[model samples]
Target: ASMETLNDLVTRLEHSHPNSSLLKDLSLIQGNEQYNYIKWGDLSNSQNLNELVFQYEKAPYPSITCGILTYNEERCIKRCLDSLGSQFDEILVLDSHSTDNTTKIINRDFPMVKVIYEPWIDDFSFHRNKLISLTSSEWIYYIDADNYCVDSTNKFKRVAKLIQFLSIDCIISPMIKEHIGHVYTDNRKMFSVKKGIQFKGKVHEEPINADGSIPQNITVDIMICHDGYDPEVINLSEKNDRNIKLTRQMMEEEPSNPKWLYFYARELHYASEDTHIIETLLIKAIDLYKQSTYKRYQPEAILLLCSILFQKRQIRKLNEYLDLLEELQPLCSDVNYYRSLILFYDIRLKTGKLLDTLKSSELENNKYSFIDSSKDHIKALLIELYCSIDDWEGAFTLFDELQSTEARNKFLRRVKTINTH
Candidate 1:
């Protein structure tokens, strides 16, 4: 058989199974290079794509339950529930004494969803375990109240099938696209549920097996959108206080736990006015991790340390931490961006020094001491440095204070000149 045979097969299947789930899945794989190769390359040597579709179609798949954890989430609960639609076999919400209309909305709109009201105990694991216990399906995908499930592929129904098929009693973590104001962050959100599966930790709780050990998990392509950090939706300062308190308690209980140290440092990063406090926490966290194991958050702590060092203008310490950051996370985009700043600032400093040297005339007896343009030169350099480092207010202030329009015009010309090249 040739490519002609494969084309003919697809045409026949397309007509026969026009609305097949397999066909829909096939359409989603159009841009994949491997799928394209199998479809168009030597058909005789390859297992037929259409045949594989038929095999998948014949296999039985199971449905999964959706468990949501909520507090006062009146803003996005309806949108979240509506997005879930009919993908899950059952939808359960575990609310921790919401004083708002969150429960009221759920009861009014989603009568199918069972809401479990539990007291707020300042422990994430408590609510998570409760939901896990109450789930009807063997596989439950847990989401936050603010999270909007963006699954158009009906992939939730197939999660149970996948877990059972592999005989893997493990959690399936999906990508959570977190919208923190203007910034977008990608991280995994736990979607675990089994007969004996439970959660651990007071803050940033993790999934654990019945034996009280961390379960092996695999990451999936499913995306859940969350905008909990949006200032309009919720106040970060309030969350920061709660997070710091919980994490502080965790630190007090286990003084040497690197996980708590890292999380504590992270929480302190928001509320602590003193950089030294956070810096010390991060350093201790890194040291603890170095003595034993490493996690994704290890490098994150290092990066935060680097930011603090940069802010303090501790160039030597900043470079040292940046080196460690590069060693731990070589592919981190922040490394190159920070390095670029280092190079730019070094050049600016050199330029300022050269201007200083030019202004200092050695000869005591001169016809006239030339008027010094060095002050303007240094001011211009400072403006450039401020602008480069996102201190726009400083740059604007310096620009406004220029004595001559020509001096300001020169800076603008230099900026315009660099833009093209």
Candidate 2:
């Protein structure tokens, strides 16, 4: 109820009245409430031990306008803006005729934020591009209302500055997404607005050059936090159904576009938990993966298909695809990894062939060194392949590199006892 009152008071604040006091009050209030915050380089000293960690400095500010898109984001809007603090030069919103107090809250709480609206078009690229046009700053910090920049101590500012200072034009940011009781820090949100980059597709829009070429993405060290993984948030937003609708519309318009097809299939899979739809789309996607194309749609589509097959225990189909991938893409990392796994499970695969495939897959992994293929899982798979062929030396070598999980360590000790010294 106190939190609800805090939100209500926040919503009621006027633009004229400075609500720094409310922020201060929110700082002082204490509880064992489930909220996580990390303080960096204390802004408030020893006595105040960081109630809400911050230092006020907007001077020599970064040349960046935070580009946001919204329908009805009143609840999270102020918090989002506050999280970014005063780092950005401006805040620009490309609203889709929000019926809620989203625009009202922005106008009331933040004078720095600017808003412009257009009728619902069901086209994300159309609106995102428009936001880019109107943004005054040279750098664009694209964010959804549920997300926030927690680079409060300006530790990340050095990287942000380094990009602009060195005349670099992009920042692909990592995000810590909270869902259920787990936290995932692997996802990314891209920022390339300063380089005249534009987006395409109605759903799952990607950064592309205006001339319709792919953008050279530059990943930065900064991490943002998003609450999208929360089931309550997911249900409240209803973006799953909306996303599915927009994605299907996109598929109709660009049926042959491999990137669009991959994204569309993922959205469908995400919405309905429908691997059947995903499997069909992925088959089409793999067929369209290359026209002698270089890293077009990525190995994820192939991986997802393999995962589904493995989960369903469809060994024959898995074997068929592994052969297909070998004929089509002999040197692909994802395909080879899946092939290695399939070989181990099939029991019919020759020991020599299985060992050779795993070795080849490990070699292919170096080609995609930056790809997040979960080294632990891949290594675990490698160790199993070694054990399958009775190569104790190779198995122990990989086992040494594995993460120190409790179950994994216990299992490793047992496996070590089985192998000859």
For all the candidates, what are their Cα RMSDs to the real structure?
Answer: 7.1, 18.1
Question: What total of clashing residue pairs does each candidate reach?
Answer: 0, 0
C-alpha lDDT values of all predictions = 0.69, 0.63
After the best TM-score superposition of candidate 1, give how far the Cα of residue 417 lies from its true spot, in angstroms: 11
Residue pairs clashing, model 1: none
* Cα-based lDDT at residue 63, candidate 1: 54
lDDT of 2 at 106: 86
Cα error of candidate 1 at position 350, Å = 2.7
Model 1 per-residue lDDT tens digits across residues 92-123: 89888888999999999999999988888988
> Taking the tens digit of each residue's C-alpha lDDT, what string does model 2 give over 263-291?
77777777656788789889888777764
> Each prediction's TM-score against the native?
0.72, 0.60
lDDT winner among the candidates?
1
Please state the error at residue 144 of candidate 1 in Å.
1.7
TM-score of 2: 0.60
